[PDB]
Design a protein around this ligand. Structure first.
Ligand SMILES: [Cl-]
Ligand SMILES: [Cl-]
Ligand SMILES: [Zn+2]
Ligand SMILES: [Zn+2]
Lengths: 21, 30, 30, 21, 30, 21, 30, 21, 30, 21, 30, 21
C-alpha cells in the first residue's frame, strides 16, 4: 500500500497522486 | 521530479503537497 | 488536550499524530 | 468542514479523531 | 487515539499539539 | 524520560500530556 | 499536481520534496 | 521571485522545479 | 544568524534546533 | 514573552538560546 | 548552541532557520 | 558535503552557515 511503495521502497510525486481523492 | 523515501509525517506532508484541495487518504494498514 | 488553530499542512500533521496507524482522510471543501 | 473549521476557527483533537480510518 | 514512535523534532511537534498554551518542557537528558 | 517512553518505546497522546506545564 | 500557497519554511519543504537528491537553491529577494 | 510569488501569490510544483540543481 | 519571525509550531521547531540535547522549555503567555 | 515576541515581532537564535535547559 | 544529526527535510529546515533571507543551497550530491 | 557533515556526522548551527548564500 502507500507505506510499502514510497517509504519502504521509493516513489515519485506522480505515484503519490494515486492517493488523492 | 525525483523518487525518494517518504515516511510517516513526511509522507503525509508530501500527500498534502501533491493533492492539496483535492484531499487525500493516508491508509498505511492497506 | 487543548483546542487547536490549524491551517494548511499543520492540520495534516495533527491528523497524522491523532490517528496513527489507523490513518485518516483529509477532505477540504471545494 | 473540519479543514475549514480548524483554520477559520479552533477545533479539538477529539473532533480530528472523527477523520481517522 | 494511538501509540506510535515520536522522535526528535516530531516528538516536540506532538508536545506542542497536546500542551499548546499550557506550555511544556522537552528534556531528553532526563 | 520522554525519549525512552515515546521514541525508543511508544507512547500515547495522553502520556505526552505528562510533559505539559 | 495542484497550485500551492507557500510561505516561510513551507516553501523550503516543498522545494525539498520536488527536487530530491538534485537539491535546490533557496533565493529570497532582499 | 519564486520565494515571494509562492507566498503573496500561488505557484506550481513545475515552477518550483526550476530551482532544483 | 538572521532574525526570525516564528509563530505556532515553527517556534518550537526553532527551539528544538537551537537547544539540541539540552532540551528547552516552551512557555507561552496565558 | 519569547513566544509572543517571536510571533508579533522578530527574535534571534540568541534570544531563543535562553530557553534551553 | 549544539551539534546534532540533521537529515533530509530536517536539514533543510535548519538551513532555512540559520540563513533565512540570505538564502542557501542544499546540494546533497556535493 | 552537507549530508556527510551534519547528517551522517553531526554539525553545529555555525557549520550550517557554511551553506548560506
Ligand atoms: Cl503558517
Ligand atoms: Cl526520521
Ligand atoms: Zn506554518
Ligand atoms: Zn523526520
Amino acid at each position: 500500500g502507500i507505506v510499502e511503495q514510497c517509504c519502504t521502497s521509493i516513489c515519485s510525486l506522480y505515484q503519490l497522486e494515486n492517493y488523492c481523492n | 521530479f525525483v523518487n525518494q523515501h517518504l515516511c510517516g509525517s513526511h509522507l503525509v506532508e508530501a500527500l498534502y503537497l501533491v493533492c492539496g484541495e483535492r484531499g487525500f487518504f493516508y491508509t498505511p494498514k492497506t
